[PDB]
Motif scaffolding. Structure first.
Motif, short mmCIF file in Angstrom:
data_model
loop_
_atom_site.label_atom_id
_atom_site.label_comp_id
_atom_site.label_asym_id
_atom_site.label_seq_id
_atom_site.Cartn_x
_atom_site.Cartn_y
_atom_site.Cartn_z
N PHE A 259 10.18 -25.80 -33.69
CA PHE A 259 11.51 -25.62 -33.13
C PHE A 259 11.90 -26.73 -32.17
O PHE A 259 13.03 -27.20 -32.20
N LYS A 260 10.98 -27.16 -31.31
CA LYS A 260 11.30 -28.27 -30.42
C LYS A 260 11.56 -29.54 -31.22
O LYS A 260 12.48 -30.30 -30.90
N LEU A 261 10.75 -29.79 -32.25
CA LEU A 261 10.96 -30.97 -33.07
C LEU A 261 12.31 -30.92 -33.77
O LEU A 261 13.06 -31.90 -33.77
N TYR A 312 14.06 -21.44 -29.38
CA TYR A 312 12.79 -21.97 -28.89
C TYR A 312 12.28 -21.22 -27.69
O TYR A 312 11.14 -20.75 -27.67
N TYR A 313 13.12 -21.08 -26.65
CA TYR A 313 12.66 -20.49 -25.41
C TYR A 313 12.14 -19.08 -25.63
O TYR A 313 11.25 -18.62 -24.92
N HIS A 314 12.69 -18.38 -26.62
CA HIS A 314 12.18 -17.07 -26.98
C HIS A 314 10.75 -17.13 -27.49
O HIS A 314 10.05 -16.12 -27.46
N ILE A 316 8.37 -19.62 -26.49
CA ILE A 316 7.41 -20.30 -25.63
C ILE A 316 7.47 -19.70 -24.24
O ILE A 316 6.76 -20.13 -23.33
N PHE A 317 8.31 -18.70 -24.05
CA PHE A 317 8.15 -17.83 -22.90
C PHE A 317 7.34 -16.60 -23.25
O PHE A 317 6.57 -16.11 -22.41
N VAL A 318 7.46 -16.12 -24.48
CA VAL A 318 6.72 -14.96 -24.94
C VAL A 318 5.36 -15.43 -25.43
O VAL A 318 4.61 -14.68 -26.06
N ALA A 366 3.65 -22.97 -19.59
CA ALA A 366 3.99 -22.95 -21.01
C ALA A 366 5.26 -23.70 -21.34
O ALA A 366 5.24 -24.53 -22.27
N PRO A 367 6.39 -23.50 -20.65
CA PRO A 367 7.59 -24.28 -21.01
C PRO A 367 7.43 -25.78 -20.83
O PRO A 367 8.06 -26.54 -21.57
N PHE A 368 6.63 -26.23 -19.88
CA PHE A 368 6.46 -27.66 -19.67
C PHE A 368 5.43 -28.28 -20.60
O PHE A 368 5.29 -29.50 -20.59
N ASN A 370 4.97 -28.41 -24.03
CA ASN A 370 5.45 -29.19 -25.17
C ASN A 370 6.11 -30.48 -24.74
O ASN A 370 6.23 -31.41 -25.55
N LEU A 371 6.52 -30.58 -23.48
CA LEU A 371 7.09 -31.82 -22.99
C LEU A 371 6.10 -32.96 -23.13
O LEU A 371 6.53 -34.11 -23.20
N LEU A 372 4.81 -32.65 -23.25
CA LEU A 372 3.79 -33.69 -23.35
C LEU A 372 4.07 -34.65 -24.50
O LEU A 372 3.90 -35.86 -24.35
N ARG A 521 18.06 -37.82 -20.30
CA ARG A 521 17.74 -37.60 -18.90
C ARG A 521 17.37 -36.17 -18.56
O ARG A 521 16.97 -35.91 -17.42
N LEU A 522 17.51 -35.22 -19.47
CA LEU A 522 17.00 -33.91 -19.07
C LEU A 522 15.48 -33.86 -19.22
O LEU A 522 14.80 -33.47 -18.28
N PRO A 523 14.90 -34.25 -20.37
CA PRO A 523 13.44 -34.34 -20.41
C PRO A 523 12.94 -35.65 -19.83
O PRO A 523 12.06 -36.29 -20.41
N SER A 1035 17.17 -11.26 -22.23
CA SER A 1035 18.47 -11.23 -21.57
C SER A 1035 18.91 -12.62 -21.14
O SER A 1035 20.08 -12.98 -21.28
N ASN A 1036 17.98 -13.39 -20.57
CA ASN A 1036 18.28 -14.77 -20.23
C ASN A 1036 18.75 -15.53 -21.45
O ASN A 1036 19.73 -16.29 -21.39
N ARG A 1037 18.09 -15.32 -22.59
CA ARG A 1037 18.50 -16.01 -23.81
C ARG A 1037 19.87 -15.55 -24.29
O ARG A 1037 20.67 -16.36 -24.76
N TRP A 1038 20.15 -14.26 -24.22
CA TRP A 1038 21.44 -13.76 -24.69
C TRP A 1038 22.58 -14.31 -23.84
O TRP A 1038 23.62 -14.71 -24.36
N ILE A 1088 25.25 -21.41 -13.42
CA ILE A 1088 24.81 -20.02 -13.43
C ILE A 1088 23.38 -19.89 -12.93
O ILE A 1088 23.05 -18.91 -12.26
N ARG A 1089 22.56 -20.91 -13.21
CA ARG A 1089 21.15 -20.93 -12.76
C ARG A 1089 21.11 -20.78 -11.23
O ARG A 1089 20.26 -20.03 -10.73
N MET A 1090 22.02 -21.48 -10.53
CA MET A 1090 22.07 -21.40 -9.07
C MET A 1090 22.87 -20.19 -8.60
O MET A 1090 22.50 -19.56 -7.60
C1 LIG Z 1 14.60 -24.50 -19.93
C2 LIG Z 1 13.42 -24.75 -18.97
C3 LIG Z 1 12.72 -23.70 -19.13
C4 LIG Z 1 12.90 -22.37 -18.38
C5 LIG Z 1 14.10 -22.43 -17.42
O1 LIG Z 1 15.29 -22.29 -18.11
S1 LIG Z 1 16.26 -20.85 -18.13
O2 LIG Z 1 17.54 -21.19 -18.65
O3 LIG Z 1 15.50 -20.03 -19.01
O4 LIG Z 1 16.24 -20.46 -16.76
C6 LIG Z 1 14.02 -23.79 -16.62
C7 LIG Z 1 13.92 -24.99 -17.58
C8 LIG Z 1 14.71 -26.06 -17.59
C9 LIG Z 1 14.61 -27.26 -18.51
C10 LIG Z 1 13.76 -27.02 -19.75
C11 LIG Z 1 12.78 -26.05 -19.39
C12 LIG Z 1 11.38 -26.03 -20.33
C13 LIG Z 1 11.04 -27.43 -21.14
C14 LIG Z 1 12.37 -28.01 -21.55
C15 LIG Z 1 13.04 -27.02 -22.54
C16 LIG Z 1 12.38 -29.38 -22.17
O5 LIG Z 1 11.45 -29.93 -22.72
C17 LIG Z 1 13.79 -29.98 -22.00
C18 LIG Z 1 14.46 -28.95 -21.00
C19 LIG Z 1 13.23 -28.26 -20.38
#
Ligand SMILES: C[C@]12CC[C@H](OS(=O)(=O)O)CC1=CC[C@@H]1[C@@H]2CC[C@]2(C)C(=O)CC[C@@H]12
Ligand SMILES: C[C@]12CC[C@H](OS(=O)(=O)O)CC1=CC[C@@H]1[C@@H]2CC[C@]2(C)C(=O)CC[C@@H]12
Length: 1364
Positions: A259-261, A312-314, A316-318, A366-368, A370-372, A521-523, A1035-1038, A1088-1090
């Motif tokens: 999914f990340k790919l 994806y986040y669904h 690699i958080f679970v 876990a979320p960080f 795959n950034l490797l 610039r986000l990753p 809920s965060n994902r929805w 919304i995060r803040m």
């Molecule tokens: C998305 C997440 C993960 C969990 C939080 O996000 S939230 O919306 O669920 O609060 C904070 C956070 C912010 C940036 C996200 C990160 C996990 C690794 C991410 C997805 C990358 O490789 C590129 C963006 C990175």
């Protein structure tokens, strides 16, 4: 062109068949084919096939360079025979999850994909060999890898599958609604909506969470890790946790890397589509729909770049949750059975730190993780397009931003070594707070309190000056997310212009590049977070290795299968040791116990008693011998173990509750007396979760649990050690002794008692770990050997006003200076971007490029401002935040000191320490950064929205409905996820409460063979946290889907309103509009995060401000109403119908007092048991306000006198005098009001001169907490000195004979006699020795005056004073 069209045939077929297929897939009720290795690979061909349907596309986009913008047919066919494959690999998955096995529709799909590729196959081969060689190899290989993939997929779909075998009816409650969810409804997280509704009309409680799904119930994911960890051992035919952790969490991590790919290779479509849109919007011969199509599939390629990410986040958080559960489960399984030696060597408070930290940061990794690899693929790719776009200049830009990785970690190591290495100021200040809080009484009767106020204010200001530069170096995380974009774009364009002045800057270069820097610039800012989390988890893994590689404790220490006839316990010359290396404590010990025979163990203190019973259970590694038992046992440790649950559980202990037996055991143990005392009956909470039971009751409950467990062989251990003697006799009589219930039970007793010996059956004499004598006491009494020597809305969002409150705490000349200043910075940023637009569309017409050196210039001086007007803001926010703390903290402290003593009485001194610990911490350094980043995010969103509006003017029409939809989704989230956050944050601590309890109790958990029964409880206590950490993730994902459609239905409209007004504008404006509409879904999650990191934190300001105006009812000092100076020497006390009570609506303790003692006279007060004589003392100091009656002193009313002046003149010796940690100079004169010679003179008279002179510190002798380094008597001597310094005409005594010994009582009475002859004296005591000698004595009874005369007059009256 006659075949690029022909490849569309299968795609349109599958697309049109889809909505007429999901209505038949749901006609199969439930099949749930198991995940075989075919279907696991039938969906890996397709994903790889998409990944080769990518180069089949980006080859087409390569025409942008060299000039040839591709025709739509030349770049939509790979884009749509690429989308369907992400739908082929999705109907493959959704089909298997339903009953169908022979796909039918999808085998036809692959068949047509093969057939329509036959013609180019039948053509490309002939054209290649005959005419030569490769002939555009890229479109060749991308075809012939597509053909191989589609052929293999068809063949694999030609196979059959297993029968459904599905299930019976599973279970009644609300099941986790991802099972039984239609295709379209699980793709968009639409199934969670039912709670999003229910999470707004009602509150959420544990009964209404998703009944967790069967795969991961924390007893099926621990097993999946225990099996791997076992099978990963030395394996000769050393072991590491990491290998097992990978082998058990690699299936769920190479299916979350696909999914990340897919996402980050689908994300580089939009910048290139933007290039296409910009470079068609200039062309006047391109038909209109060539831009409408690009807008359409810039939406339908951005509601898919962010649907394979919010999905994806669904996944690699679970799996972060599964890390956090597998680690905790396996650690708990280990900690149950390791060794007592290992527990002793380590710390019982450290083992628990193997959860809640040090093994939970695996959930935060876990979320960080795959950034490797996703960082070195979001770069070596986003560098490519940029280099293709602006040329080598781009390097500089990216270089700068790469350079911002260390200098954004250098502060992360200056801070975190500037806020925790020097937060011990907070430690000492909170220690002083605790010291001030308890013992506030004596601190408040005298006027010592404002000196302590000054002390704590000084330490606080020291702690804040160290916090100024602890938040300025945080305004470097508002320089990465609000000022670095402009810097990097400026430096890129600068190097681009300077290198060679022959390269113009046009829209499709500058704005594509500044929309691509966004993607890169986000990753590249969450990458330092990766370094931090990974480098502090590489030590957690080592620590978990250290714990798991610890020696167990079952070398079959005891065998429970065989025994000698008629015997229960036997040991054959065994030897035991508390550590495998230390000398054995026991040497060849031999005992033969008959069945049901009580045995006592004797010796001196330090012979080896307690190490006998501990050896029997199997916690003492036997070097030699064989220890035997037969039957269940019950163990009562000397340090009795209390379960952190209710008394019913802590006595039943996993049995069947029979009220007859239960009650009779409780009464036999003689615990009903506590039950009648207990506030709630036999359900009262115990342990740290409940009332802290003293030592006496814990052994009672432990023994009761043991006897109700009615095991075969009771192994007691001096349970009667910390209980009253007489009841202990009944305890032995009714339970242990032969008369008791346990006549037929094999009891083994070890104790230091003597009287219990004759009633025993056998006795074993222990010497240096060796048995000497065995037998009954009457027979053993014949020996008289060394044994003879042993003899001698309430729930909801916060009110708006509290926000204003915080502003009023920052100065309100700073709130304008910060809000106005962000408005200025946002105007500067939009000015910079509009100037860039007016530069880029200027460069296309102007034949002269010489003007460029101006625009560049002013661009700098229009964006550099946007930095200098944000930093100069953020500091003046952090430098306000600490200020916001300071005053606010003061406004709390200066009120808690001024609260009535009843406030500290009705409170357990725990809530009033919650503040000054956490609720003052949040406003201290947790609220200011969050509000700063909220105020950054809001103005980022404002600048983005206004630049989009300005660039495409008619776009304003839709800006309202998007706003209402986004606010709707935000409110629904802020309801339901707030509920879930509350409900999970309170259900997690029971895990660590159930741990820290098995660790101490591992000795008694075993020997009840309850270890297996006692880990299922841990499984259910972590399950009751999983079942509320899952739906929070979903809920965060929805939410993030809801805020994503309203962040892509605006990319659609930006591009569409760009193309609908092509004849009007010039390309420099659509570039800005679309490139800043691409990140209106990043500054719309950030906002919304803040805005939910501030709704759960600004509750703290409300609480802190609420703890004020709490009826202080006590003015320290008055305006001019001070009594005349030199006031005490008159020293007359007089009363007029005085009456007082503790609380409003409380039974009067004092009534119609009318008493008078003249100037300089001596008098005491005596009261019968229950008269309430103590309150009188406080009445003198206005601690309790005069209810009815004015206590006049020297002819002046004390109700109109400042306490700090009123209390200073009097002199009190409290009932429980206490010292305060620090020097002696502070402990006798914080105000420094007396000469040191008289201080030493008073210290000399205080019977302390020898002690003070013996210490060179002396006056600077650092006292412990309460002067614990001094004895009790020395503390009353110190406080006697305390009273001595003041030397006023009025003296009053509080319990001169409360609990002190007779020796020091004589000294204090003599000291009272010698110096205080002239001064007026008042006295309260438990003994009349210091009272009978008074000139006049008042006798208080039930709150009224009875006998106020001389003791000789009282003797004649023969009252209670003369009664004894
Ligand atoms: C998305 C997440 C993960 C969990 C939080 O996000 S939230 O919306 O669920 O609060 C904070 C956070 C912010 C940036 C996200 C990160 C996990 C690794 C991410 C997805 C990358 O490789 C590129 C963006 C990175
Ligand atoms: C907003 C936050 C987290 C807090 C950071 O600021 S800090 O002061 O807390 O360090 C900034 C930061 C960086 C990336 C942000 C992240 C929160 C969630 C975000 C907005 C997404 O879904 C995509 C980008 C993610």
């Amino acid at each position: 062109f006659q075949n690029s069209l022909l490849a569309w045939v299968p795609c349109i077929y599958l697309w049109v068949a889809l909505p007429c297929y999901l209505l038949y897939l749901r006609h199969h009720c439930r099949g749930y084919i198991i995940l075989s290795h075919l279907s696991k690979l039938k969906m890996v061909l397709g994903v790889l096939l998409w990944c080769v349907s990518w180069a089949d596309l980006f080859y087409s986009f390569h025409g942008l360079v060299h000039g040839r913008a591709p025709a739509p047919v030349f770049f939509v066919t790979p884009l749509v025979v690429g989308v369907t494959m992400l739908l082929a690999t999705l109907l493959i998955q959704y089909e298997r999850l339903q009953g169908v096995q022979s796909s039918g529709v999808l085998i036809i799909f692959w068949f047509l994909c093969v057939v329509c590729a036959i013609v180019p196959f039948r053509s490309k081969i002939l054209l290649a060999k005959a005419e030569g060689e490769i002939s555009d190899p890229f479109r060749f290989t991308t075809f012939y890898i597509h053909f191989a993939l589609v052929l293999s997929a068809l063949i694999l779909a030609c196979f059959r599958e297993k029968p459904p075998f599905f299930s019976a009816k599973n279970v009644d409650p609300n099941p986790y609604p991802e099972t039984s969810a239609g295709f379209l409804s699980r793709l968009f997280f639409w199934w969670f909506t039912k709670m999003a509704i229910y999470g707004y009309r009602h509150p959420l409680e544990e009964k209404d969470l998703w009944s967790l799904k069967e795969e991961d119930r924390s007893q099926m994911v621990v097993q999946q890790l225990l099996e791997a960890w076992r099978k990963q051992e030395k394996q000769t035919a050393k072991p590491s946790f990491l290998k097992a952790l990978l082998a058990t969490f690699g299936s769920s991590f190479l299916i979350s890397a696909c999914f990340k790919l897919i996402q980050d290779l689908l994300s580089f479509i939009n910048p290139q589509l933007l290039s296409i849109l910009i470079r068609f919007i200039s062309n006047p011969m391109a038909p209109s729909w060539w831009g409408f199509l690009v807008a359409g599939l810039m939406f339908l390629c951005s509601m898919m770049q962010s649907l394979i990410l919010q999905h994806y986040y669904h996944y690699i958080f679970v799996t972060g949750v599964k890390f956090r559960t597998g680690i905790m489960g396996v650690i708990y399984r280990k900690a149950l059975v390791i060794t007592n030696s290992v527990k002793r060597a380590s710390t019982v408070g450290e083992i628990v730190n193997l959860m809640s930290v040090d093994a939970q940061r695996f959930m935060d990794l876990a979320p960080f993780l795959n950034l490797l690899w996703s960082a070195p693929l979001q770069i070596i790719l986003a560098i490519y397009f940029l280099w293709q776009n602006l040329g080598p200049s781009v390097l500089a830009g990216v270089a700068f931003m790469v350079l911002l990785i260390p200098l954004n970690g250098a502060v992360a190591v200056k801070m975190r070594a500037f806020q925790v290495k020097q937060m011990k100021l907070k430690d000492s200040r909170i220690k002083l707070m605790s010291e001030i809080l308890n013992g506030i009484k004596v601190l408040k009767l005298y006027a010592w309190e404002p000196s302590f106020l000054k002390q704590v204010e000084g330490i606080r200001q020291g702690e804040l000056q160290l916090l100024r530069t602890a938040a300025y170096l945080h305004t470097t995380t508002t320089f990465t997310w609000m000022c670095s974009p402009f810097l990097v774009t400026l430096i890129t364009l600068w190097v681009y212009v300077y290198v060679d002045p022959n390269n113009v800057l046009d829209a499709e270069k500058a704005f594509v590049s500044v929309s691509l820097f966004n993607i890169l610039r986000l990753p590249l800012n969450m990458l330092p977070q990766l370094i931090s989390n990974l480098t502090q988890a590489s030590v957690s893994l080592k620590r978990i290795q250290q714990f798991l590689s610890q020696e167990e404790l079952d070398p079959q220490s005891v065998e429970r299968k065989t025994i000698s006839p008629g015997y229960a316990i036997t040991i054959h010359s065994g030897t035991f040791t508390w550590a495998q290396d230390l000398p054995p404590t026991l040497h060849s010990l031999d005992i033969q116990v008959p069945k049901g025979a009580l045995v006592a163990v004797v010796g001196p203190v330090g012979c080896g008693k307690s190490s006998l019973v501990s050896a029997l259970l199997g916690e003492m590694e036997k070097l030699e011998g064989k220890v035997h038992m037969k039957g269940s046992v019950a163990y009562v440790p000397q340090q009795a173990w209390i379960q952190n649950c209710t008394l019913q559980e802590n006595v039943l202990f996993g049995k069947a509750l029979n009220p007859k037996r239960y009650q009779q055991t409780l009464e036999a143990c003689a615990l009903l007396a506590d039950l009648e005392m207990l506030p709630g009956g036999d359900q009262t909470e115990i342990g740290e979760k409940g009332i802290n039971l003293s030592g006496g009751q814990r052994q009672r409950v432990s023994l009761a649990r043991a006897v109700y467990s009615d095991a075969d062989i009771f192994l007691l251990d001096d349970p009667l050690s910390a209980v009253d003697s007489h009841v202990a006799k009944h305890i032995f009589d009714h339970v242990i002794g032969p008369e008791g219930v346990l006549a037929g039970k094999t009891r083994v007793l070890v104790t230091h008692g003597i009287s219990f010996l004759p009633q025993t059956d056998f006795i074993i004499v222990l010497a240096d770990g060796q048995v000497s004598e065995m037998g009954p006491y009457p027979a053993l009494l014949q020996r008289n050997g060394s044994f003879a020597n042993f003899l001698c809305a309430a729930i909801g969002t916060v009110e708006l006003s509290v926000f204003w409150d915080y502003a009023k705490a920052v100065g309100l000349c700073t709130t304008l200076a910060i809000c106005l200043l962000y408005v200025g910075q946002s105007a500067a940023a939009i000015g910079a971007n509009v100037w860039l637009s007016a530069w880029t569309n200027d460069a296309m017409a102007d034949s002269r490029q010489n003007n460029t050196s101006l625009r560049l210039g002013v661009y700098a001086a229009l964006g550099i401002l946007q930095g200098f007007l944000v930093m100069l803001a953020a500091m003046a926010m952090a430098a306000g935040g600490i200020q916001a703390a300071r005053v606010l903290h003061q406004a709390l402290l200066h009120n808690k000191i001024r609260s009535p003593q009843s406030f500290f009485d009705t409170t357990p001194s725990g809530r009033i320490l919650n503040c000054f610990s956490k609720d003052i911490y949040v406003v201290d350094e947790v609220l200011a950064p969050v509000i700063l980043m909220l105020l950054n995010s809001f103005f980022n969103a404002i600048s983005t929205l206004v630049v989009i509006m300005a660039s495409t003017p008619l776009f304003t029409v839709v800006i309202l409905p998007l706003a209402v939809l986004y606010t709707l989704v935000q409110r629904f989230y802020a309801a339901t996820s707030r509920q879930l956050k509350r409900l999970e944050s309170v259900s997690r601590s029971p895990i660590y409460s159930h741990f820290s309890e098995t660790v101490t109790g591992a000795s008694v958990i075993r020997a009840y063979n309850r270890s297996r029964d006692f880990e299922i409880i841990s499984d259910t206590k972590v399950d009751a946290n999983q079942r509320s950490c899952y739906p929070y993730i979903i809920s965060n994902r929805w939410l993030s889907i809801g805020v994503e459609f309203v962040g892509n239905c605006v990319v659609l409209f930006a591009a569409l309103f760009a193309v609908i007004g092509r004849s009007s504008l010039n390309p420099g404006l659509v570039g800005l509009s679309v490139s800043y509409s691409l990140q209106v879904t990043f500054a719309l999650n950030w906002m919304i995060r803040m805005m939910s990191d501030l709704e759960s934190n600004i509750v703290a300001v409300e609480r802190v401000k609420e703890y004020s105006k709490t009826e202080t009812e006590a003015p320290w000092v008055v305006e001019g109403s001070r009594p005349p100076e030199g006031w005490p020497p008159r020293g007359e006390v007089e009363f007029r119908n005085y009456s007082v009570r503790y609380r409003p609506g409380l039974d009067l303790v004092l009534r119609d007092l009318s008493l008078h003692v003249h100037g300089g006279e001596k008098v005491g007060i005596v009261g019968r048991t229950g008269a309430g004589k103590s309150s009188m003392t406080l009445c003198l100091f206005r601690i309790l306000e005069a209810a009815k009656g004015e206590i006049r002193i020297d002819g002046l009313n004390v109700a109109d006198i400042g306490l700090h002046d009123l209390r200073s003149q009097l002199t009190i010796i409290p009932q429980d005098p206490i010292l305060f940690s620090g020097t002696l100079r502070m402990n006798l004169d914080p105000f420094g009001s007396y000469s040191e010679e008289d201080i030493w003179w008073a210290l000399e008279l205080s019977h302390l001169h020898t002690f003070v002179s013996s210490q060179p510190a002396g006056l600077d002798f650092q006292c412990s907490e309460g002067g614990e380094n001094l004895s009790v008597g020395q503390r009353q001597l110190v406080c006697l000195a305390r009273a001595l310094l003041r030397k006023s005409r009025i003296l009053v005594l509080d319990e001169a004979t409360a609990a002190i010994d007779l020796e020091t009582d004589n000294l204090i009475q003599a000291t009272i006699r010698t110096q205080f002859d002239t001064c007026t004296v008042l006295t309260i005591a438990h003994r009349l020795n210091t009272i009978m000698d008074y000139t006049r004595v008042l006798v208080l009874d039930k709150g009224v005056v009875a006998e106020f005369d001389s003791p000789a007059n009282l003797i004649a009256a023969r009252g209670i004073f003369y009664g004894m």
